[PDB]
Each structure stands twice: as structure tokens, then as C-alpha cells.
From a paper:
HIV-1 and other retroviruses integrate a DNA copy of their viral RNA genome into the genome of the host cell, a process that is mediated by the virally encoded enzyme integrase (IN). Each step of DNA integration, up to formation of the integration intermediate, occurs within a series of stable nucleoprotein complexes (intasomes), involving a multimer of IN and a pair of viral DNA ends. Because integration is an essential step in viral replication, intasomes are targeted by an important class of antiretroviral drugs, the IN strand transfer inhibitors (INSTIs). INSTIs work by chelating the two Mg2+ ions, blocking the active site and inhibiting the strand transfer activity of IN.
4d potently inhibited the IN double mutant G140A/Q148K (4.6 ± 0.7 nM; FC = 3), whereas DTG did not (132.0 ± 9.9 nM; FC = 51, P value <0.001). This suggests that the G140A/Q148K mutant has specific properties that make it particularly susceptible to 4d but not to DTG. Last, in the G140A/Q148K_DTG structure, there are changes that would directly affect the binding of DTG. The G140A substitution, as has already been discussed, influences the configuration of the residue at position 148. If residue 148 is Lys, the mutation G140A leads to a repositioning of the side chain by +240° about the γ-carbon, bringing the ζ-nitrogen to ~3.6 to 4.4 Å of the two Mg2+ ions. This reconfiguration, in turn, polarizes the charge distribution around the metal ions and weakens the chelation with the bound DTG, reduces its binding, and, consequently, leads to drug resistance. In the presence of bound DTG, Lys is positioned closer than both the Arg and the His variants by ~1.0 Å, which explains the ~10-fold loss of DTG potency in the presence of G140A/Q148K mutations. The most strongly coupled pair of IN mutations is G140S/Q148H, followed by G140A/Q148K which is also among the very top pairs. Despite their detrimental effect on fitness, DRMs containing G140A/Q148K combinations appear in patients demonstrating their clinical relevance.
Residue numbers in the entry:
A (entry chain D), F (entry chain J): 222 to 268
B (entry chain C), H (entry chain I): 212 to 277
C (entry chain A), E (entry chain G): 1 to 228, 236 to 268
D (entry chain B), G (entry chain H): 2 to 39, 57 to 139, 149 to 228, 235 to 270
The structure:
DNA sequence: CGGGAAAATCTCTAGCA
DNA sequence: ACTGCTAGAGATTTTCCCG
DNA sequence: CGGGAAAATCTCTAGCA
DNA sequence: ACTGCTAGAGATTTTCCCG
């Protein structure tokens, strides 16, 4: 599996780790505490 | 018949990009067009490009100018 | 490095040293220090340095609202060509956006629209307008203008042209239409050295012509190709290479180890 | 290159246009245009009344593609705004009008002057009738008449299909404008190359037609001749 | 092209077409259309696309003020090394800035400071402090943070480290000092794989050593070189090339056509 | 001589033409109506 | 490489340190350190009273470089803040103190724990006297005592010059810290290379000294020998 | 005497940039140092760099490591 | 001289507000 | 007459290591 | 085949707010 | 399951043109 740390929306604080669900070119779909978020790959780090 | 149609298909020029390259590449020659993918010929190299990453034109400047 | 690793993790809990510092100060291999950094949640504060690429299909239009002189300007761009369509509207209301999008659909073959998550673009009236005209709504990731960078740069260009030609008109709407005209037909460049209008006409005509020609070719040219597999469909052959489509997966294989039936 | 004699014979026999020869015998369009030599901007403007509101309708004559919207009043300002929009969206060169009060106002004339449109004072009536028919068909799906008018424009432009090849008005106007762009491109190339004179083998001056990579195509005494780049010189006059 | 030029200038007064459009639409050469555009004041709306480079001498320090948690943080950076010095101050006042700069001058060899045009940095108290310590004030072009991009990026880095280590301290000033410590001694990278403190020590020691060594060399090595001219001073010779200084103009010439006396 | 068009300070409107006095790497000194201004070369065009 | 015997002879004759041999005979520092083998972090802290205000003075013992500022009160919080600042600006390893109330408080101990400083409880008195002299000299140029204290620190650190070579305290501390950085670099290199064993020509294991591009320097039976890369193998143990 | 001093001068490494190039170039060898200009040797090429565009270090890592 | 692995280098982005 | 930079995350290229 | 000039291409930045 | 771009200003490289 993977760990994702991200910067969701207008919040400069980084959040994580989240479960990586889908990895596309430019954006990733993640799950953070039963919440599905779509984050651009600029604002995310996958480990 | 078929050869004329193939020649017309190959008369179109395609501008395209790669997944990690942000600059548009030169006018490759169109070989095949599909719903989600186009087949091009760029400098003696055949590539398959997603339809969302390709701009297929003709260039009437060129056409009417050799 | 068991002793060195413990003294580096203990230091990282205090200083959050980067992998280079702990590698130097505790004789750790680079991979070990990188593992130490990567396991600290407090040091995950930077995303990867790349950019995505927007959809450039001929049917995609990017819409956005901009503000000038206290008014609201609704702007649409054809992504493949740069052809723009702008109009001053009384307010950022779903009714005005629905009307503008219905006009756009009635003027050009609009298949899908890519907008941000503004209230007007997410209204049920705009959804009903898109459903009637068969337009597929794609909404960007919230607070990510880079998803609609095309329409954002078009907003910049439109504002520059409006500033250029503001004196010739007395209202803002006349200047907006004048700027649309100037951008669409009086500015050349891009892929074909075209204007926006010439490029969009070329794009749509090319789509129609290529669709019809490929339909005729596929109707006439019917063959099955065996390579290395199953009866793959033949797409293009010649120049020592064959392009085939097996199980909706298009691959290019050389003429060798391939037979056309 | 080698097909110039064949193209001349084909033109003498069948009077084919330069498009056919360029598409068949693999010739540059300038050579074909010389051999054969040896509407897209037309719009009609009208005002139509429906349910007490004024609808300004613009039709592309060569294709039947319509541009209509409900205007608040039959005033030269509103129609000038409409025409400026139309010029900004399509290559409008001239508009046909019915000598109405809103079409001969000074504002509309100024709009035409700025947009480079010439004003000149049966298809429009049939187009208005068809638009009214479609509006009556789709009125029940819209609360306001302006939304219904745009629905009717969409339907007429992309859903109703007729003609020889069964294309819609949008496809027809796109094809027509593409053909006009090709025509303008060819005209610009002809104008660019017409200022040159060529001397070959040295013979008298010859009008230049094409400047190919491996040959130069020229015209001398109403006859087209192909000479190599290495046996001729081109000068500007 | 006399007729074409007039029809293009007349169109440009209306549309301000770019050079490509008028070159295409009026058969103009590219230079003529570019001249038409370049003579229109309304189309001069873009500067050249490059960047300058900040002074990187060992004596330059860049100062700036940043704000965090409602407090003011005065930050200084040594440009050559990245060594930073930060301190929470009660207010953006010329007294506090003068005190901070006097401290900085008393701690390190500060020869010149590069700041923006804030009120505290332009105060007469700061000027008097710089005069007493022999510090030369360089003020950036107004509203151009790129002139102090070094201290701006250092503000970003300091804020990131403060966010990392905020929980370990109860006040902001303690966390600021902790972040300064971490940046200066617990983060490696850069030119020598150094920390900021190691790099600044290396820079200052190298300056001193090179100055003394070059002074001794110039005292011992005294020659005049004639090339092609006057008695140019000899700076370095060898490997088929000679470096000379003629009339305060340093040039490199090959060993041929040069004689050392 | 030279013509300089520039964007001085927090004003998005471009101004000019001005007399070019000194051209350095990264910035230029100009004269616009007896007023001496120093503008970065990013925010200036010299003709 | 070839100068190893000369370096051994020089060490046997004059007992020179590895720095001199590495600077003279062109040897890597590890080889010289092996041949010769075959304070920078020290600070003193004190509190001084002047005109009813408390001045906290930190001196670098090996160089005489001072760090002083006026603190609002003689409290462990203030001196902990001062020491955290000092650690953030200079590589402070241990501080000497006089068992005062503000130096044995829990806050200062926590600051030392976080900053990696060891607390241990004549130069400081002379330094305080010199600081007082300079403060009295430059008091007339400052309204507040805190500004004058910083002026005195600046003067003592960079203007007053004395010693063998006539350098100031700032140059001395810079040189000392540079030397300490060199020492730490050499120690890290020694630790990195000490985990390897070399077999040459195959003979017994030999401690590795240098891994040059064209040769490998090793030690066998208290003797340094140079072998080619192509006649020896290096393994990690 | 003089040769030792020259060798020590050439033992220092310089990081520098050009007027239009924003990336710092590799550690060239220092030949001469002046008030406003330094003379370097980068890959068998001698250049003169303004003092404000050069970072002259030694690199104690390297020194104490060959 | 030849692959693999590790290291070095290059590319590229956000935030500084 | 003054001037974008820095540090980290991936991707790609060089170099080292044993054969 | 050789320079010069012109054209094409590449690089790089602000604004979109 | 989604995604920076665009147009202009300089600098550099290719190509064309007459020898
Ligand atoms: C009132 C003082 C004096 C007059 O001007 C203001 C406004 N200002 C604005 C920024 C700023 O825009 N930072 C973001 C940023 C953007 C681009 C870039 F290249 C570098 C950057 F840091 C500052 O940092 C800053 O210190 C000030 C300031 O101090 N003042
Ligand atoms: C309330 C709606 C919906 C929710 O979000 C807000 C805020 N917003 C912000 C920008 C903006 O930041 N433009 C500058 C920019 C910066 C970077 C870049 F890559 C592209 C850019 F255009 C917009 O353009 C925009 O349309 C909106 C908007 O519409 N809304
Ligand atoms: Mg928006
Ligand atoms: Mg926007
Ligand atoms: Mg500032
Ligand atoms: Mg700032
Ligand atoms: Zn950490
Ligand atoms: Zn203009």
C-alpha cells in the first residue's frame, strides 16, 4: 500500500497519512478517515 | 479507392504532447484516428497518443502552398 | 548501524534533520537517513514537482467568470483552438450561466464543459441546461485554477485587449465584444499560425472529415492480424510496422512476426 | 510535376476546376489555379415579433445557419450590439437588411465601420418561419421565450438535418468557412509569388508559379514549363 | 508595400493586431509588421522574460520582517552561505531594527545590508546604526521582493521549521530560536553539502586566508607584461595563458604574443 | 536613443515612453517627465 | 604516495603533527594521521551588573570572542533564552557557569538538553573587566546601556586587535571553528573507512587508509604500504 | 616560497554564475582573487568572474578526504 | 569490457505575501 | 545608478563494483 | 561548399486572483 | 475517479540565397 500526505483546499497545513485509491497523471484519489478526496499531484506526496 | 482515402487521412497533421512533457510537439502525420487514441508518425517513429492530448488540424497555409 | 540509527531518530524527534545531516552526523547510508525522514509525519510538507495537462479534445470548453469595472464577464474558451466567447452578465447567477451555455451549445458543437466549483456553475439550472443540450459537466478540483489554466490565461488576454480598446467604446459590454472580435480574428499565432476563429474552423472541419474518412476506411478495410495471439483488428500497416487493436488495447508491432488475413 | 500535361488535357476535356486537379494529379494549388485560369461572408438580418417580444435573426445564406436572440427593444443600439457579437464570433463581411429604422441608425453604421462590414439594403422569411415552427414545438420546455429561442436555434443548427449529403447547418457553415480560408490562403500565396520574375536556361522573363525543393515551375507564353533550380534564376521586380 | 502598410496601420488603430496578423493579412514582411507594432504605445505591455541575480559577496546580508501568530520576526540572512539570524521584536520600529543590526554587526563581519523600503529599515536610527558600524545600506527597487528573494525564501524556510517545532516550545520566540538553530546546524545541502553555520565559517575563513595569501603573492610576484601595449600588471601565468590587469581591466591572453619582464 | 515602457510600482497600467539612462543586468534607470525611476528589466521593455 | 617514507622520517626526527606532513609532503590527511598515530565548543557564562542592569556575558575561551546582552532580570528563563540563541548562532557544546541561581534552574537545564549542551559548574573576569572598560569608553555615544553594550561587543570582537599574529577575536573564532570542522570531517572519514579490510597480493587482512584513484594505501604490521587497485581486494567487515 | 602560496591559492574551489544563467556552476579552481573580480579555471577554460557572482569555499569534506 | 546498484546530477515547483 | 531564490521530490545520467 | 540575413525555434515570464 | 497555459520579448539555431 501507500501513504499520502496532501494539502487539500486553501489550508496551508499538510495532512496525512491517507490511503491511496487511484493514481492518475496530475491528480490522486485518497481516503482520509472515511472521506474521499481528490488532490492534484502537486499538492500530494505518495510514499 | 482505399489508397486515396488512406492518403487523405495521412494528409492531416497532428500536434500532441506526452504525459510528463508540457511542450507541444511538431506536426506529426496522422495514420489512424479512434474514439480515444490516434496513431501518428513523427520523424520515422510511430506512437499512439490519447485523444485528449492531440490537436489534429490540416493547415490550410501549407496545403495551399505545397 | 544500530547505535547510529537510534541516535539519529532521537535527534530527528528534536530537530527533524534532513537526510543529509543525519547521514553525515551519524555515518548512516543515504537510504537509511532517507528512511528515517520518510517515516516522520512532521517532515511531509512538499508535493512532487510536476504539472498535469488539461483535456484538449475538440469538444471540451472551459468556462469561468471574471470581474472588470465592477461588472461580471462570463468567458468560455474552446481548449483545442483558443477560440473565446465572452459576454457581460448582470450577476453570477445560474440563470445567466445556463442561458450563456445554451447559446454556446446552439452555436458550436459543445460536448463537455470544464468549470470550477462556483455557485453559478454548480446550480441545478445549469445542470438542466447541460442535460437538455447533452453537455457533460466536468468540475475541477476545488481551489485549483490550474485545472482551468486555459480559461484563466484567456481571462488575462481578454482583460489586456479590453484595456487596449476601452477608449473606443463607451460601455463595458461593447468593449468586451470588441476584444472578443480582436482575439478571435485579429491575433495570429499558435499551431498553424492561425487566428482563433481560423483554428477552430480547422479543428471542427478536420474532426468531421477525419471521422467520415476513417469510417469509410474501416468499412472497406476489414482484416484480422495474428502476431507473436488472437485475431487482432488491423488499423494501419506499412513501413515495416503494423498497428493493431487487440481487446481494446492498441499496440504497434513490426511487420515481422505478424500475418494479415 | 510530371502531371501538368495530364492536368491540361483533363481541363481541356472536362473543364474541371483547380480543386479536382490538385486533389487528383498531385499538383500544388497554384499550378492548378493557373491551368484553370489559362458568399461565406453573406448574412441577412431581420427582426421578428413573437408573443410581444422582438427576435433579431441573422442567417448565413450559403449554409442556413442562424443566429437569433430576443432583444429588449427594436433599437439601433441593440441591433448594433447583436451585429458586433456576430462579427466577433463569425467572419461577417456584409449584411443584408430591410431598410428598417433600427438598421439605418448611426450606431449600427458605426458598428459596421468598426467591424469591417458592408451594409446592403426570400431565404430570411422561410428561415423565420422555420424558427417560429421550432419555437412553437419547444416552447413547452422553457418558461421564458428567450430560452426557447435558444433551444430552437440549437435544434435548427445541429439536430435538423437535410440537403444533398444530409448535413446540419453547423457542419455546412464550418465546411464553407474552411473552404473560404483555403481560398484566402491561396490568394495570399498567389499575391506573394506574383512579384517575382524567373530567367531559365537566358530566356525571357517568366511568371513564377511554384518554388519546389527540387524544381521550379514557371509560365512562359501561356505554357507551363518545369525547370530545375540549378538552371534558372529568380529575381524580385 | 506602400498601400499595404497604410491599410495595416489603419487596422492597427482599431484592432491593435499583432505582427503576425498584419503580416498575413496585408502581405507585409515580418520586419514591417513588427515595426508597425513597435510604434504603437498601446501594445507595449510586456517586459523581457529574464531574471537578475542578487549580490552574493561575503559581506552582504539581506534583512526582512515577517509576521507569525500576530508577532513580528526580524530575519537576516548571509547571502553567500544561507546562515540566518532571527529574533522576535515588539514592533517594526527603527529602534528594534537598529538594535538587531548592531547585534548582527557585532557578531559577524557585516559590510552591507540589502533590505526593502519598509519604514523601519529606512529610519534615521537604522542609518545612524549602519554609519557607526560601517555598514552600507542598499535599498531594493520598491515593491520588488525578487531583489531580496534570498531573505524571502529564508522567511519561508524559517516559517516551515517553526511550524515543525512549534509544539516543543510554549512561546513563539523560543520556537523561533529553535528553528534558527535547526536551520543553521541541522540541515545539510548546498555547495559543500554543509550546514549554514559550517558554510558561513568556511566562507569567512576562505575570505581571510585568500586575502592574506594573495597579498603575500602580490608582494613577492612583481612583473610587467607586454602583449600585442602598455606595462600590464601580471596576475597569473601558466598553461599557455596569461592573466593580466591593464588600466583596471582584467583580460586573459594566450602565452603567445606576450612577454613577462 | 531608446524608448522604454515600464510598470513602475503596484500599478498594473504600463507607462511610457521614457528616456533610457542606464542599462544594467536586471534593472534599468529611466527618465519619465523629469522623474528618475529605477525599474527591474522584468517590468520594462526597451526599443 | 611516494612521500610516505619521507613523512615517517620527518615524524621520527621532529615529531611533527599530521597537519604539517599533509601540507608539506602532499599526503591525504588519513595517511598523515595514521603516521602520527603510529576547546572550540567551550563557553563560559557569567552575569555582570552595570548601572543597575544585568548583563549576561558569554565568552569563547579558545578565542576570547564575547556574546553579551542586557537582560531584563536575572532569571533562568532569560538566561535559557540567551543560551538557546547562542547555541543557534555558534556550535556550543558545553558551557561553564558559576553555580548561580539562574544557571541551575530547570528551564536552563531543559534548554541545554534540547540544544545538546553539557553544563559544567579566570578568563571570564578579565573579559568582564575589558567589556566594562569598553562600555565606559563608548557610553557617551549611546543613550541606553543596551546599545552601548552592543557597541562594546562589536569593538572587542572586530576592532581591538592583539595576540601573536595580531588578529581580532572574530577572526580567531572563525579560524578555530574552521579547524574544528576539519577535525570532525577527518574523524567522520576515518570512521567511514575503518570498517573495511583489504587483502593484497593473498596476504593477511590490512586496515584500509586511502582508496585513491590509482592506488590503495593500507597498513600491515604497523607499516604503511601502497598497493595497486589491480592487485588487491577490499571487503567490508 | 611563491610556488607554495600559488598552490594554496589554487587549492580553493569557486562556485559562480554567469550574467544570464541562473544555475550555479561547478567548483572551478581559483587562480587569482581581486577586490571585484576572481580568476577561475573551469574544465581547462579560464574565465573572469565578478566578485558578487562567485562563492569561494574550500570544502573541508574534500580536503580531509583527498 | 558489461550489467546492477548506488550516487550524483538535473528538472521543476511553492512559498516568500 | 540594480538584479529571484531555496530546498525537497522524482527522473535521468555517471560512476563504482565486481566479475 | 561559405558567410550573411532572414526565418524558425527555443527559452522564459506575468497574469489569470 | 484528474491534470497549467498563453502570448510576447530576446537569444540561439536552421535554412535560404547567391556566389
Ligand atoms: C511595507 C514593506 C515595504 C513595501 O512593500 C511591502 C510589501 N511586501 C511584499 C512581500 C511579498 O510580496 N512576498 C511574496 C513574494 C512574492 C514574490 C517574490 F519574488 C518574493 C516574495 F517574497 C514581502 O516579502 C515584503 O517584505 C513586503 C514588505 O516588506 N513591504
Ligand atoms: C468562488 C469561485 C469558486 C472557488 O474558488 C474561487 C476562487 N478563485 C481563484 C482564481 C485564481 O486564483 N486566479 C489566479 C490564478 C492563479 C493560479 C493559476 F494557476 C491560475 C489562476 F487563474 C480564479 O481564477 C477563479 O475563477 C476563482 C473562482 O472562481 N472561485
Ligand atoms: Mg472561477
Ligand atoms: Mg478564474
Ligand atoms: Mg519587507
Ligand atoms: Mg518579504
Ligand atoms: Zn521530522
Ligand atoms: Zn497597437
Amino acid at each position: 500500500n501507500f501513504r499520502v500526505y496532501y494539502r487539500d483546499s486553501r489550508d496551508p497545513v499538510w495532512k496525512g497519512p491517507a490511503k491511496l485509491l487511484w493514481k492518475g497523471e496530475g491528480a490522486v484519489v485518497i481516503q482520509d478517515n472515511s472521506d474521499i478526496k481528490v488532490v492534484p499531484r502537486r499538492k500530494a506526496k505518495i510514499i | 479507392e482505399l489508397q486515396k482515402q488512406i492518403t487523405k487521412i495521412q494528409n492531416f497533421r497532428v500536434y500532441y504532447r506526452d504525459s510528463r512533457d508540457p511542450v507541444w510537439k511538431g506536426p506529426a502525420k496522422l495514420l489512424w484516428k479512434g474514439e480515444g487514441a490516434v496513431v501518428i508518425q513523427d520523424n520515422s517513429d510511430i506512437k499512439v497518443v490519447p485523444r485528449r492530448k492531440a490537436k489534429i488540424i490540416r493547415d490550410y497555409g501549407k496545403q495551399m502552398a505545397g | 548501524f544500530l547505535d547510529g540509527i537510534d541516535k539519529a531518530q532521537e535527534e530527528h524527534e528534536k530537530y527533524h534533520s534532513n537526510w543529509r545531516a543525519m547521514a553525515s552526523d551519524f555515518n548512516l547510508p543515504p537510504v537509511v537517513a532517507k528512511e528515517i525522514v520518510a517515516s516522520c509525519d512532521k517532515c511531509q510538507l512538499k508535493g512532487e514537482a510536476m504539472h498535469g495537462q488539461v483535456d484538449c479534445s475538440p469538444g471540451i470548453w472551459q468556462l469561468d467568470c471574471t470581474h472588470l469595472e465592477g461588472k461580471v464577464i462570463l468567458v468560455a474558451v474552446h481548449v483545442a483552438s483558443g477560440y473565446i466567447e465572452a459576454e457581460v452578465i448582470p450577476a453570477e447567477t445560474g440563470q445567466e450561466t445556463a442561458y450563456f451555455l445554451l447559446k454556446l451549445a446552439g452555436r458550436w458543437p459543445v460536448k463537455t464543459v470544464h468549470t470550477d466549483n462556483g455557485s453559478n456553475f454548480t446550480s441545478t439550472t445549469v445542470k438542466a441546461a447541460c442535460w437538455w443540450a447533452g453537455i457533460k459537466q466536468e468540475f475541477a478540483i476545488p481551489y485549483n485554477p490550474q485545472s482551468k489554466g486555459v480559461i484563466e490565461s484567456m481571462n488575462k488576454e481578454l482583460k489586456k485587449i479590453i484595456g487596449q480598446v476601452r477608449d473606443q467604446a463607451e460601455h463595458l459590454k461593447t468593449a468586451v465584444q470588441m476584444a472578443v472580435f480582436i482575439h478571435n480574428f485579429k491575433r495570429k499565432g499558435g499551431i498553424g499560425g492561425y487566428s482563433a476563429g481560423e483554428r477552430i474552423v480547422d479543428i471542427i472541419a478536420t474532426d468531421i472529415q477525419t471521422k467520415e474518412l476513417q469510417k469509410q476506411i474501416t468499412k472497406i478495410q476489414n482484416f484480422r492480424v495474428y502476431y507473436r495471439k488472437g485475431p487482432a483488428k488491423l488499423l494501419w500497416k506499412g513501413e515495416g510496422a503494423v498497428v493493431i487493436q487487440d481487446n481494446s488495447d492498441i499496440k504497434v508491432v513490426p511487420r515481422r512476426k505478424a500475418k494479415i488475413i
